[PDB]
Amino acid sequence: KLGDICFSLRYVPTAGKLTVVILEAKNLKKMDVGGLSDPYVKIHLMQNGKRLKKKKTTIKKNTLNPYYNESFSFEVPFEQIQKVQVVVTVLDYDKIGKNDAIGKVFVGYNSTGAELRHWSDMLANPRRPIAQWHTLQVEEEVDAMLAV
Ligand SMILES: [Ca+2]
Numbered sequence: 609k610l611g612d613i614c615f616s617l618r619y620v621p622t623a624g625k626l627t628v629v630i631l632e633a634k635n636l637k638k639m640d641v642g643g644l645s646d647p648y649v650k651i652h653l654m655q656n657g658k659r660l661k662k663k664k665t666t667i668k669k670n671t672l673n674p675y676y677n678e679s680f681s682f683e684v685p686f687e688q689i690q691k692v693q694v695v696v697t698v699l700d701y702d703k704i705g706k707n708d709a710i711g712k713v714f715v716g717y718n719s720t721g722a723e724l725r726h727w728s729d730m731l732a733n734p735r736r737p738i739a740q741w742h743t744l745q746v747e748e749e750v751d752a753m754l755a756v
């Protein structure tokens with residue numbers, strides 16, 4: 609498995625500002641042989657399949673069920689909040705070597721089910737934040753979904 613990461617959402621149309629708040633990851637896969645992991649979360653703002661912004665949170669050295677509660681801000685127009693998708697990706701850090709991909713979640717157009725409901729709930733609450741548990745899925749499949 610990959611695990612599950614909880615993150616919040618908060619759109620402000622009055623100003624046209626998108627907000628993504630990282631909360632915590634759990635059941636994260638072990639990337640270190642017989643050891644722990646160093647998973648962190650990242651956020652990417654894509655336009656119906658077009659990379660626009662890239663963000664990353666702190667790194668929880670040696671762990672698999674760490675907390676974050678980080679607040680990120682984006683600049684998405686009230687007319688784009690529906691055409692954009694916030695992708696929450698969790699990657700494992702490895703000092704020198706490259707960072708392994710634990711998994712990644714996505715919310716927005718291409719999204720569906722609990723993911724689409726969250727993004728929609730966000731727009732429904734253009735003032736109050738929306739937190740929910742997002743189960744990290746295979747990044748490759750995730751990228752395949754965004755691809756039309
Ligand atoms: Ca590793």
Ligand SMILES: [Ca+2]
Pocket residue numbers: 639640644645646700701702
């Ligand atoms: Ca590691």
